[PDB]
Amino acid sequence: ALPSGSDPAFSQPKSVLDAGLTCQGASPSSVSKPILLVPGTGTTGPQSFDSNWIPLSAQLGYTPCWISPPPFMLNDTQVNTEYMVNAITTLYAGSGNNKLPVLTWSQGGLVAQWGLTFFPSIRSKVDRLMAFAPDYKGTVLAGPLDALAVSAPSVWQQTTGSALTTALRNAGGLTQIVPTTNLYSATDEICQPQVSNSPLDSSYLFNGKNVQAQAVCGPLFVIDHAGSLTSQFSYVVGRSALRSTTGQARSADYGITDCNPLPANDLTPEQKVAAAALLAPGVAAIVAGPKQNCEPDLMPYARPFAVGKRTCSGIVTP
Ligand SMILES: [Cl-]
Ligand SMILES: [Cl-]
Ligand SMILES: [Cl-]
Ligand SMILES: [Cl-]
Ligand SMILES: [Cl-]
Ligand SMILES: [Cl-]
Hints:
Rossmann fold; two-stranded antiparallel ribbon; alpha/beta; Stereospecific_Lipase; hydrolase; binds chloride ion; seven-stranded mixed beta sheet; signal
């Protein structure tokens, strides 16, 4: 069974969580058909989505909303999740007490599933999850000890084997909690392993709609970590998932003819250029951000699920 009962307390003051939430042309507290966008590591909401799902979700009839947890999604993934939980509580009420879809890139999907696993109050407020290149198992390519003995807190947590990914898995988080679509690529240069088209893949959730692009488009089809978010193929799958009556993308809605790895057709020329350039801010932000030589401690609500792991303060104990 999943964690149940009360939501964990926020470590951040709520006013700080509110400051990280924005909607385009609307207040989060009075918004029609919001979609909550959760960005990837090293980026803000606008940096992740200005070139793709902010305009694309608008043209599908949603009000694009996003969180930008400081600094650039580099802090503790457990803190980034508080931004999302507060945003769901706010947007649910602000939209007339209606469930809303959540759309994510990279760590944003890990954040979404962490929130669903450990904050039971939001399960009934999230309609569906559309995750592009989510690293629910982390990645073996993270290299928190690569080129420098200190790395951002969330880089430690997204390393395969981390206490965080261990606790997510042991608490039941690798099975979908709301209707979920995961779109990912075997050629992802940031998140691996993704090659098996099976539960071994970091983006795979049991009972989710798990769409490895090469399983539809062929073994030699190439989209990278950013293209998993921005490509025309990704748009067709994401549009399917958002419109589906089941809450998940439908195999009937996309096919080999949608296997275009370039930025979504409906983007402006300036958006397509920006979409192709995606990753660079969120490679550089690392440089100027918080860095440490250990994985952040697990919050008490998650510690029983990673017994035997090791974090900054010592051995994980319940
Ligand atoms: Cl507070
Ligand atoms: Cl605005
Ligand atoms: Cl922002
Ligand atoms: Cl990462
Ligand atoms: Cl189309
Ligand atoms: Cl550690």
